Amino acid sequence: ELQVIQPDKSISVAAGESATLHCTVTSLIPVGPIQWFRGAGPGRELIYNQHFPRVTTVSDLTKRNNMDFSIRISNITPADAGTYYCVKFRKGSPDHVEFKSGAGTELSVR
């Protein structure tokens, strides 16, 4: 069964530096997008969906068999502090449905 693995429980970044948030999936099935959020609450913030100026993917997503969905966030400030979740969605009608979430990585800003 598909796992969403966020190895880092927490990371510590100096304001102005970049944060690398790691996430890998263990399957391409079921088919559907990976999204990053800050928070797991009902008003969680969208951080990345396959636009946001300061985010890039660590790996090349336009590549068959890719299972790395780690992201890099540039120019970190205290406004970025929080817990970041990598979330797999299954494709559906009308829209994609949340399938499974990674464990969360806490970003502290020094």
Structural domains present in the chain: 3-110 (2.60.40.10)
Q: How was this structure determined?
A: X-ray
Label residue 13 left, alpha or beta by phi (over 0 means left) and psi (-120 to 50 means alpha): beta
Structure tokens at 83: 């817990």
Which among 16, 35, 31, 25 is positioned nearest to 91, based on CA atoms? 31
93 DSSP assignment: S
Q: What's the CA gap between 28 and 109, in Å, rounded?
A: 33
CA angle 8, 11, 12 (to 5 degrees): 170
Q: Within 13 Å of residue 93, how many CA atoms lie on the same side as its CB?
A: 0
Resolution of the experimental structure, in angstroms: 1.8
